[PDB]
Ligand binder design. Structure first.
Ligand SMILES: Cc1cc2nc3c(=O)[nH]c(=O)nc-3n(C[C@H](O)[C@H](O)[C@H](O)COP(=O)(O)OP(=O)(O)OC[C@H]3O[C@@H](n4cnc5c(N)ncnc54)[C@H](O)[C@@H]3O)c2cc1C
Ligand SMILES: Cc1cc2nc3c(=O)[nH]c(=O)nc-3n(C[C@H](O)[C@H](O)[C@H](O)COP(=O)(O)OP(=O)(O)OC[C@H]3O[C@@H](n4cnc5c(N)ncnc54)[C@H](O)[C@@H]3O)c2cc1C
Lengths: 338, 340
C-alpha cells in the first residue's frame, strides 16, 4: 500500500512528490490532465522571473526541470484520472476514489489541486511560432497596458466577462469571442452589458494567430465556417478558473471563506493525515507564487512523514549531503553536466 | 528616503531585494561578508537538488543566479558592513546602524540574518581544484558512509564534537583539529575523550588540502608553526551555528523571540513590531523549513508585507512576473535572441 497519495500534478504536487520521495515515502501522483504541470501548461511561452534562483526563461523550460524533479524518486503516476471522493476509513488508512470507479488506498492524502480542473486551450499560431509571441496574454493583472488598444478575449466564462469589463474602462474596443450559445454567468453580463465598447461574438472561435507580436487574428464561425481576419493589438485567452467548484464540496475539511482549504498555520488541514499544499491552501505565509507552492510541498511531505512515522525526524536531510545522490554527483562533476 | 533596508545578503535577503524591487520599492541590501550569498558560500562545489525547478548543479552556480536575481533592479548594496543596532523612531522611519557608526534610514526593515555572522573558512587547495572535490564535507547527516575511513574534522564547536563521536562509532579513526584550548563545553569533549579512536588536536589548524577528492591534509600548529602531513579519506569543515548570538539579543528594539532564539513570526514574516520583518532561517512560523526553498517564499511575503505597510492601499501581493510590465522590454530581447 502506498504511503501518500498526492492529488494534483502541479508544481506543488510535483515538489511534494519529490520531497516525499526524498524522505523514503511511497508516492501516488494523480492529475486530471494528460500531462503534468498544472497551471504552468496554460502559459508555456511566457517568461517567468519570480521563481527563486531561476534565471528568466520560458515556463515550458522550467516545467521540464520541475516535472523531472517531481519524478526523481519515480512515483506511481496516474494521469487522465479525476478524483471525486476522499474517505478516511481510519488513522493512516485513506481511500481516494476517481470518477471511473478506481479506488486507491493511502496512509495519507496531500491535496494539491490549485483552483480545480485545468484544461489548457490549444492555440494554433501561423506565420510565427507561439514561443516568440509577446502580446498573447493568459491573465490580466495590471491593465494600464491596454490603453486605446483593440483587445480580443477568448471565452465567455465569468472571468473573461469580468476581464472584458475592466479592460473596457480604458481600451478603445473589446471583442469577446467564445462559442457555446450565450455567455456563462448572469452577474458578469449585467455589469458588462453597460460597457458600450464591448462587442459579443457568440458561436465564434479564434482560428489562427498571425515581428514578435500577433498582428492579425482569423476568426471563424462554428456553423457556416465563414472566416474573416481582424487586426488586434493584444490577445487574451481565458480558461475560467473558479474556486469553490472543486471536489472539496462533496467528499467527507474546514474551508476558508474563499473556498480554499483552511491551513492551520501551514499545510495542516482539519483532518489529521490530510494536508493541502499550493494555491489551494490558505495560511498567513501563503503567496500566489511558484515559490510558495514549493515551500508548501516540502511542509506537506514533512508533516506526512511524521504523521505516518511519529519518531522520524521533523524535516528531511538537506540534498547537498544526502547519500542517495552521491553516485550521480560524481558523474555531474566529472562530465560538467551543468 | 529608502523604502526598505534589508539586513542580510543570503538567499532570503537576495530574493527579498528582488521582490521588493518588483513592487517598485527602493532597496538597501547590507551584508557583513565580502561577497553575497550567506550560507551558500560555505559549500559552493556541493550539488544542490531540492531547490524547486532547479536541475542539480553546483551551489556556486545557483548562487550566481540568485545574486543576479537580487540585483535586477540594482539596489544599494553595502558589503563588509556589520549591523549592530535597529531603531524605530516612528512609523515609516527606521534607523539601521553598523559598527562603524554609519546610520541608514528606511521606512521598513527586513531582517534576513539567518543565524548570525557567517565567516567561511578560507581553504587553500593545492594539486586539485575545489570544485571537483567530492570527499570534502561541510555537514554530517548520514554517517554510515564513513565506515572504516580515516576522517578529519576541523572545528571544536558542539556540533563538530557531536559529529566526531557519531562518526567514531564506525570509522577507523577520527582526528579533531581546532584552535581553542577548550572550544567550550565540558560534556561534549568528555563524551568524545573516551572514544579511544579519536585524537584531539587543540591549537591546530588546517593549512593545505592536498590531492576528484582530497587525499592528504597539511596541518600546522598555531603559535609554533610546526607542520605535518596526514593522509585522510574524508575532510569535514564545521562552521558552528548559534542562533542565540545574533544582534537581536542586544538591540534598541525588542522583537518577540522564539524559545530557540528565532524571531517569533506571527503566522509568517510579520514580527511584533510593524515595519520590521524577518525572512529566512531566522524566523519561525508553522510553515517554515530549513531549506533554501523556504527562504525564498519568506522573502516574497516579507516584501509584500513591507509594501502594504508603507502603502496600505497598494495591492496585497505583487503582479506575477509572467505578465509583469517591468520585464516586457527585456522579454523581447530574451525571446528574439534566444537568451536561455
Ligand atoms: C497565468 C499564470 C501565471 C503565473 N505566473 C507565475 C509566475 O511567473 N511566478 C510564480 O511564482 N507564480 C506564477 N503563477 C502562480 C501559479 O499559482 C503557480 O504557477 C502554480 O500554478 C501553482 O499551482 P499549484 O501548485 O497549486 O497547482 P496547479 O498549477 O493549480 O495545478 C493543479 C493540478 O491538479 C489538477 N487537478 C485539479 N483538480 C483535480 C481533481 N479533482 N482531480 C485530479 N487532479 C485535479 C489540475 O488539472 C492541475 O494539473 C501564475 C499563475 C497563472 C494562472
Ligand atoms: C540542499 C541544501 C543544502 C544545504 N546545505 C547546507 C550546508 O551544508 N550548510 C549550511 O549551513 N546550510 C545548508 N543549507 C541551508 C541553507 O544554505 C540556508 O537555509 C540558506 O542559506 C538560508 O539563507 P538565509 O539568508 O535565510 O540565511 P543565511 O544564508 O545564513 O544568511 C545570513 C546572511 O546575513 C549575514 N548577516 C548576519 N548577521 C548580520 C549582521 N548583523 N550584519 C550584517 N550581515 C549579517 C550573514 O553574514 C549572511 O551573509 C542547505 C540547504 C539546502 C536546501
Amino acid at each position: 500500500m502506498k504511503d501518500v497519495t498526492i492529488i494534483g500534478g502541479g508544481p506543488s504536487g510535483l515538489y511534494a512528490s519529490f520531497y516525499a520521495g526524498l524522505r523514503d515515502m511511497s508516492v501516488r501522483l494523480i492529475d486530471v490532465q494528460s500531462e503534468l504541470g498544472g497551471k504552468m501548461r496554460i502559459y508555456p511561452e511566457k517568461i517567468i522571473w519570480d521563481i527563486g534562483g531561476i534565471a528568466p526563461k520560458p515556463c515550458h523550460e522550467i516545467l521540464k526541470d520541475t516535472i523531472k524533479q517531481g519524478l526523481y524518486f519515480k512515483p506511481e503516476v496516474h494521469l487522465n484520472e479525476r478524483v471525486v471522493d476522499i474517505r478516511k476509513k481510519a488513522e493512516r488508512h485513506f481511500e481516494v476514489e476517481t470518477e471511473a470507479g478506481e479506488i486507491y488506498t493511502s496512509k495519507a492524502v496531500i491535496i494539491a489541486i490549485g483552483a480545480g480542473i485545468i484544461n489548457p486551450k490549444q492555440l494554433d499560431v501561423k506565420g510565427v511560432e507561439r514561443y516568440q509571441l509577446t502580446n498573447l496574454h493568459y491573465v490580466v493583472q495590471s491593465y494600464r497596458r491596454f490603453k486605446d488598444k483593440d483587445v480580443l478575449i477568448s471565452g465567455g466564462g465569468n472571468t473573461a466577462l469580468d476581464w472584458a469589463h475592466d479592460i473596457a474602462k480604458i481600451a478603445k474596443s473589446v471583442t469577446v469571442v467564445y462559442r457555446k450559445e450565450d455567455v456563462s454567468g448572469h452577474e458578469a453580463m449585467k455589469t458588462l452589458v453597460t460597457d458600450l465598447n464591448v462587442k459579443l461574438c457568440p458561436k465564434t472561435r479564434i482560428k489562427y494567430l498571425v515581428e514578435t507580436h500577433i498582428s492579425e487574428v482569423v476568426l471563424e464561425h462554428v456553423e457556416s465556417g465563414d472566416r474573416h481576419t481582424v487586426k488586434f493589438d493584444d490577445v487574451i485567452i481565458s480558461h475560467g478558473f473558479d474556486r469553490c467548484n472543486t471536489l472539496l464540496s462533496e467528499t467527507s475539511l474546514d474551508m476558508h471563506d474563499d473556498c480554499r482549504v483552511k491551513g492551520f498555520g501551514n499545510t495542516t488541514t482539519s483532518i489529521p493525515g490530510i494536508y493541502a499544499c499550493g494555491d489551494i491552501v490558505y495560511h498567513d505565509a501563503k503567496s500566489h507564487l511558484i515559490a510558495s507552492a514549493f515551500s508548501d510541498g516540502a511542509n506537506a511531505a514533512n508533516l506526512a512523514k511524521t504523521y505516518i512515522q511519529p519518531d522520524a525526524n521533523a524535516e528531511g536531510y538537506v540534498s547537498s549531503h544526502h547519500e542517495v545522490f552521491k553516485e550521480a554527483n560524481k558523474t555531474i562533476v566529472n562530465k560538467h553536466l551543468y
